[PDB]
Amino acid sequence: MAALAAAAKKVWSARRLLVLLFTPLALLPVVFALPPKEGRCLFVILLMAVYWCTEALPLSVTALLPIVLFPFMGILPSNKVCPQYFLDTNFLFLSGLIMASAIEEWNLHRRIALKILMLVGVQPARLILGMMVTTSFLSMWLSNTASTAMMLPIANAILKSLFGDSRKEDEYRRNIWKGFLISIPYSASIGGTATLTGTAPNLILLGQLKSFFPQCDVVNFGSWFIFAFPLMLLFLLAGWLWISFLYGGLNAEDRARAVIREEYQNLGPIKFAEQAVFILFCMFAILLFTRDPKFIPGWASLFNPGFLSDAVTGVAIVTILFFFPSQRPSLKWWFDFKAPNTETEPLLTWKKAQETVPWNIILLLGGGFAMAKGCEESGLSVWIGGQLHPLENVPPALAVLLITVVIAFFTEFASNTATIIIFLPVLAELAIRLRVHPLYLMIPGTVGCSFAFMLPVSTPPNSIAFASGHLLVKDMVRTGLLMNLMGVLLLSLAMNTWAQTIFQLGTFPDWAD
Amino acid sequence: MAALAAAAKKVWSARRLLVLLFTPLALLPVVFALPPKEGRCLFVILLMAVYWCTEALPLSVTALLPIVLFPFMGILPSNKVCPQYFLDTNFLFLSGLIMASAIEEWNLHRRIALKILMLVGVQPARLILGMMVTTSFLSMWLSNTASTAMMLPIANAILKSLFGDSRKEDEYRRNIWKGFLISIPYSASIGGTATLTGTAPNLILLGQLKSFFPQCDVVNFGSWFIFAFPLMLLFLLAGWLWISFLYGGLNAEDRARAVIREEYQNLGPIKFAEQAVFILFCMFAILLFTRDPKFIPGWASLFNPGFLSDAVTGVAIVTILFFFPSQRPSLKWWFDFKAPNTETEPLLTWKKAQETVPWNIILLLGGGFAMAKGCEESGLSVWIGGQLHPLENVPPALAVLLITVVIAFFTEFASNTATIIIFLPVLAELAIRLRVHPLYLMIPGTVGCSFAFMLPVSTPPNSIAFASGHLLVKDMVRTGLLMNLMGVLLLSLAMNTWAQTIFQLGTFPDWAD
Ligand SMILES: CC(C)CCC[C@@H](C)[C@H]1CC[C@H]2[C@@H]3CC=C4C[C@@H](O)CC[C@]4(C)[C@H]3CC[C@]12C
Ligand SMILES: CC(C)CCC[C@@H](C)[C@H]1CC[C@H]2[C@@H]3CC=C4C[C@@H](O)CC[C@]4(C)[C@H]3CC[C@]12C
Ligand SMILES: CC(C)CCC[C@@H](C)[C@H]1CC[C@H]2[C@@H]3CC=C4C[C@@H](O)CC[C@]4(C)[C@H]3CC[C@]12C
Ligand SMILES: CC(C)CCC[C@@H](C)[C@H]1CC[C@H]2[C@@H]3CC=C4C[C@@H](O)CC[C@]4(C)[C@H]3CC[C@]12C
Ligand SMILES: CC(C)CCC[C@@H](C)[C@H]1CC[C@H]2[C@@H]3CC=C4C[C@@H](O)CC[C@]4(C)[C@H]3CC[C@]12C
Ligand SMILES: CC(C)CCC[C@@H](C)[C@H]1CC[C@H]2[C@@H]3CC=C4C[C@@H](O)CC[C@]4(C)[C@H]3CC[C@]12C
Numbered sequence A, B: 001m002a003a004l005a006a007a008a009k010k011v012w013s014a015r016r017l018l019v020l021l022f023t024p025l026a027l028l029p030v031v032f033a034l035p036p037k038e039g040r041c042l043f044v045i046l047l048m049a050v051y052w053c054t055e056a057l058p059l060s061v062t063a064l065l066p067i068v069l070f071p072f073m074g075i076l077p078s079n080k081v082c083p084q085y086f087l088d089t090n091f092l093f094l095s096g097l098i099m100a101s102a103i104e105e106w107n108l109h110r111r112i113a114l115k116i117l118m119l120v121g122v123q124p125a126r127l128i129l130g131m132m133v134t135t136s137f138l139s140m141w142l143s144n145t146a147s148t149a150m151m152l153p154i155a156n157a158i159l160k161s162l163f164g165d166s167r168k169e170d171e172y173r174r175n176i177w178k179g180f181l182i183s184i185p186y187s188a189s190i191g192g193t194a195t196l197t198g199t200a201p202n203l204i205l206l207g208q209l210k211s212f213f214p215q216c217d218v219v220n221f222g223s224w225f226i227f228a229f230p231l232m233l234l235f236l237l238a239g240w241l242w243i244s245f246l247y248g249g250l251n252a253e254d255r256a257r258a259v260i261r262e263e264y265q266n267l268g269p270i271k272f273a274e275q276a277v278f279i280l281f282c283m284f285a286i287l288l289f290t291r292d293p294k295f296i297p298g299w300a301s302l303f304n305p306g307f308l309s310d311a312v313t314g315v316a317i318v319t320i321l322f323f324f325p326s327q328r329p330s331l332k333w334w335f336d337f338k339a340p341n342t343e344t345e346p347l348l349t350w351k352k353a354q355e356t357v358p359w360n361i362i363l364l365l366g367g368g369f370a371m372a373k374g375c376e377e378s379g380l381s382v383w384i385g386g387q388l389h390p391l392e393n394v395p396p397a398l399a400v401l402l403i404t405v406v407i408a409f410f411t412e413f414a415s416n417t418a419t420i421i422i423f424l425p426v427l428a429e430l431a432i433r434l435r436v437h438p439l440y441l442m443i444p445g446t447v448g449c450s451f452a453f454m455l456p457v458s459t460p461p462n463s464i465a466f467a468s469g470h471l472l473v474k475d476m477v478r479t480g481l482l483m484n485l486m487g488v489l490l491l492s493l494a495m496n497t498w499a500q501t502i503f504q505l506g507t508f509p510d511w512a513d
């Protein structure tokens, strides 16, 4: 009886090599079943999907697979596959990462977090709401992983201060702990969807759009923000109500206020570098939003059409971080010849940025873009559209609901970026077959692939929360059920009510025909 | 009298900000002097050159300037500038960097170095030759900086063992120390030119060729190796003779042998991971060399023409490093159910590669490629060719000699990569004006921009050597004079004797007309 368990453990130990060696053999019939070019492209895409989902290779390493496979299989030459890895969307990602690094270097995110935590309050519903609001707003510009990892110790300190009888009080304290520790990663995931740079799948959408529909240009930072921010707020409010009902029961207050205030003063007085970084961040956000919001003439209209983009603005703004002084300039230093002439330290050195930028995510986005280009060039998109014949009669709203449900449940087991990379071409082809706007299907998939709430493996913030030890898998699963359902319903509402006006989804575009 | 010195020191303290703020003002007349598009492109190129030479910004940050300037000035839209930063040449660079990281992680470079040091000998001429040979051969695949930083402590240990009377012996020991410490960075710089991935300027040449002459494809890993390896050997021999004459006088031996042998056994027994990395490196080099050597039909002829490249081969080979086990596989482990089921550690994790890959150099190469594309698209190349009217009567060999001398002396003050990036378009236009093969001028510039021997600021290996404290600036300068002259002469010999056969430089190519 134990022999089966021993064999299962032995197989599980070598699962990565086994998957890596047996996936090409399993996917080999795809090459023969389909026409040669389309079959080879589908083989490459399925191999990448399996490797991404099983972690047989590092995600960035798997993202490098098109570079080898497309030229070897004749799908796409190297001089075409390689430049796809640094499309301008990926520079927008890099600029967002650099500014997140600059914000985290000067500890500005913690200052903002503690200030918001003071203003929200200490009462348990109000404190849960403040935690969620802070994490969601910080996740617009920082990674969900970083936001969760920074907010969790503050929650631990506040909870220790609050609880520093018998069955009833023990149950109440356990539930409060679980609610606090589950509200942070959920809010981080929700807030990552509000901005294009908030999470990688949002930029996967833009990069794959540049290949499937090159003439589509209505999605940018401003339009995505005006679409997703109200949806993010509604989803955050629904999640807060659900968590408070589930866990929060919808001198301790003095101790919590004291500990929050003590940490905030342990930050120290506001520095010139912090103010400069904050002003640069405000300029970053404002210029990204006001470049071309699609319903106010932006400042991009003053330049050559079709030349400027979000990447140019982001790179230009983050370039200032590498030469702006971190100390207060003073003209008195020029006159005072007796002052020391030490060289000024910039706001961000390139060494710190390089050691803090996640180049693996950049390579993953590039692999997604190159895979989309290979799918478009090989004619595999046409084959997928032909194979989606039976689904052409589904109503567009029902189709949105079904694809959102499928993607939101698929992302519970795999990476959000990998999920959206795999699912986006199918969504585009289905939208083409349904005679509806491609964005009407592509945006819900991009938003719903971030609906990872059930398992620690779903998203890294869930893993960080689970590492605390106060959360069980069953608690996270039972919260994530309703979280996914509410997210899907709110996404359908958003796509059918105000995304239509923002992205002009009412009419089938000419470039989609 | 001291007021002038104080003012000079004050200006020097803020030199970076001063240069950054006053360079656009100084270069402003260029925009008005030239036609608008060409003038703006020249302004951008000159600004980047000044920023690179003065270190007003980090080199990678300066390399991001085209992203902002070309779309804002109408030279090139963002969707065209950005993909230039990940041309396939840059993937070949990345694969070379990953394999250098894998080699250094498993300490294989030190093992090879100590083995070569045993075989060469201990006598001072032989020991200098062994040091130079080891550093030059390791610099084909590792960075010159890494090769110098790894070889310098071994030289220090050997020299301490050797010298562990009065004026004569003290002078002899000082000269021997200086010769040893100056032979390492010179050999690293010389050996970096033998392979395309050995140094960044070699790949700058390929990337800028892809923009100036898209139909040129005769330069690759194999052809560059068969051209530069004999030239590297001749230059290394000349440098060894020169250093031995200048410094080397062209029980201590027992102590040096003992210390070398002791370090080699301190490496430990040969590991399975080291053998796997070495075999993968041999496959890397062989497959890069044999893909298309231009005088044997390579294995690329078995596939679709115009699809495979050096990048595909490099990425495919370095992908194996991320899943190949670092421990010995054994089928006995499958049968032995009582053995532990710990997960195997691959040869290289992505974390180690990411923290060891110099992404700044990747961004610098990309900035060079994008600047070349902007120069080609804006028509600035045609304007430069028109301005090179007076030099059309210079004999081609004399032109090669002059450009090599100019570049080899310019690189003594600035970065090699920046020097070649700035000088390559001028070389291409001059070759077009002289009715000679573009490579006949472009290759000597690429080789000579690595001829940085006079100053610690010239190349980072020189800085590492100067940090030892046994080398004076005058010694390095007086060695670098003759080093530069011999390098220029040998480069002219190579370009006029056997580069003609390798690259078919005898006839003016059709794609250059
Ligand atoms: C790798 C895992 C997770 C997914 C499953 C992969 C393998 C088993 C799947 C993927 C696509 C499949 C093929 C899809 C279509 C056909 C055509 C028809 O003749 C039926 C069998 C055949 C040939 C299938 C055989 C099994 C197949 C090759
Ligand atoms: C630079 C930011 C951070 C602070 C300064 C104020 C902001 C709001 C200013 C600075 C430049 C301004 C833009 C300048 C030019 C135009 C073009 C015009 O046809 C419509 C308004 C528009 C698009 C302006 C909108 C407001 C704007 C973006
Ligand atoms: C715009 C032109 C005309 C003038 C530019 C002046 C710049 C270069 C000057 C003005 C004020 C200066 C700063 C004043 C004080 C200090 C502190 C000291 O540790 C040196 C660096 C630092 C931080 C100086 C850096 C250079 C500085 C920013
Ligand atoms: C989250 C809560 C508040 C609401 C979620 C319910 C979703 C499924 C509801 C809310 C609004 C609804 C839409 C409102 C109006 C229309 C237009 C009609 O011609 C077709 C159905 C369609 C497109 C509805 C589809 C279903 C829909 C999106
Ligand atoms: C930045 C430093 C290191 C390099 C020198 C930059 C400035 C001073 C140089 C670069 C190119 C130069 C211009 C090149 C050509 C002309 C045309 C003619 O009317 C003579 C002056 C004028 C207009 C020059 C003025 C000075 C100039 C603008
Ligand atoms: C793989 C390497 C490291 C070790 C194995 C031996 C090497 C030398 C072998 C493996 C594959 C071989 C190539 C396979 C096919 C061809 C095409 C033929 O028209 C000319 C020879 C050529 C180009 C071979 C050259 C030698 C070669 C490169």
Ligand SMILES: CC(C)CCC[C@@H](C)[C@H]1CC[C@H]2[C@@H]3CC=C4C[C@@H](O)CC[C@]4(C)[C@H]3CC[C@]12C
Pocket (backbone or CB within 6 Å): A013, A014, A017, A018, A021, B325, B327, B328, B329, B330, B331, B333, B334, B340, B341, B342, B343, B344
């Ligand atoms: C090719 C197919 C048929 C079989 C593949 C078998 C592979 C997955 C097996 C064969 C031998 C195995 C290795 C044997 C011994 C050890 C040591 C132990 O700490 C587990 C990992 C490790 C390093 C194993 C990893 C998995 C392994 C490499």
Ligand SMILES: CC(C)CCC[C@@H](C)[C@H]1CC[C@H]2[C@@H]3CC=C4C[C@@H](O)CC[C@]4(C)[C@H]3CC[C@]12C
Pocket (backbone or CB within 6 Å): B397, B489, B490, B491, B492, B493, B494, B496
């Ligand atoms: C380094 C030492 C050994 C030699 C260096 C001297 C250089 C300058 C010499 C050596 C070989 C020479 C070349 C040999 C042959 C020719 C062909 C002739 O039609 C024009 C001159 C030309 C192209 C010579 C130019 C100068 C040259 C390159």
Ligand SMILES: COc1ncc(C)cc1CC[C@@](O)(CC(=O)O)C(=O)O
Pocket (backbone or CB within 6 Å): A059, A142, A143, A144, A145, A146, A192, A198, A199, A200, A201, A361, A364, A415, A416, A417, A458, A459, A460
């Ligand atoms: C450890 O960090 C990551 N590792 C791998 C990947 C693919 C992505 C991340 C960052 C997480 C996320 O992208 C959200 C998500 O994709 O799940 C974010 O915005 O923080």
Ligand SMILES: COc1ncc(C)cc1CC[C@@](O)(CC(=O)O)C(=O)O
Pocket (backbone or CB within 6 Å): B059, B142, B143, B144, B145, B146, B192, B198, B199, B200, B201, B361, B364, B415, B416, B417, B458, B459, B460
């Ligand atoms: C500290 O390392 C570097 N920093 C900056 C730059 C631009 C390049 C390097 C690497 C050095 C070199 O590229 C030789 C050279 O370009 O001088 C090599 O091959 O080691």
Ligand SMILES: CCCCCCCCCCCCCC
Pocket (backbone or CB within 6 Å): A020, A024, A028, A031
């Ligand atoms: C000509 C045959 C085409 C179908 C088989 C292709 C197999 C490619 C395997 C690539 C594996 C990459 C990860 C190890």
Ligand SMILES: CCCCCCCCCCCCCC
Pocket (backbone or CB within 6 Å): A068, A072, A073, A074, B303, B304, B316
């Ligand atoms: C019909 C032309 C292409 C034939 C070969 C297709 C499969 C190539 C597989 C290469 C795998 C390389 C792994 C490193």
Ligand SMILES: CCCCCCCCCCCCCC
Pocket (backbone or CB within 6 Å): A272, A275, A276, A279, A280, A320
């Ligand atoms: C009283 C307000 C003091 C503000 C000090 C910090 C100012 C930072 C300015 C940064 C500007 C960046 C764009 C040029």
Ligand SMILES: CCCCCCCCCCCCCC
Pocket (backbone or CB within 6 Å): B020, B024, B028, B031
């Ligand atoms: C329309 C005017 C064109 C000429 C002037 C352009 C100035 C651009 C300055 C860019 C500076 C970038 C580094 C701070």
Ligand SMILES: CCCCCCCCCCCCCC
Pocket (backbone or CB within 6 Å): A303, A304, A316, B068, B072, B073, B074
């Ligand atoms: C003729 C059309 C372009 C006019 C403006 C050219 C100069 C633009 C300079 C932008 C500098 C941005 C620095 C961040």
Ligand SMILES: CCCCCCCCCCCCCC
Pocket (backbone or CB within 6 Å): B272, B275, B276, B279, B280, B320
């Ligand atoms: C006696 C020789 C033992 C050799 C052990 C190491 C073998 C490494 C093989 C690596 C192969 C990589 C390509 C599949």
Ligand code: NA
Pocket (backbone or CB within 6 Å): A138, A139, A140, A141, A142, A143, A144, A145, A188, A191, A192, A197, A198, A199
């Ligand atoms: Na985020």
Ligand code: NA
Pocket (backbone or CB within 6 Å): A411, A412, A413, A414, A415, A416, A449, A452, A457, A458, A459
């Ligand atoms: Na997920």
Ligand code: NA
Pocket (backbone or CB within 6 Å): B138, B139, B140, B141, B142, B143, B144, B145, B188, B191, B192, B197, B198, B199
């Ligand atoms: Na090197």
Ligand code: NA
Pocket (backbone or CB within 6 Å): B411, B412, B413, B414, B415, B416, B449, B452, B457, B458, B459
């Ligand atoms: Na140099």
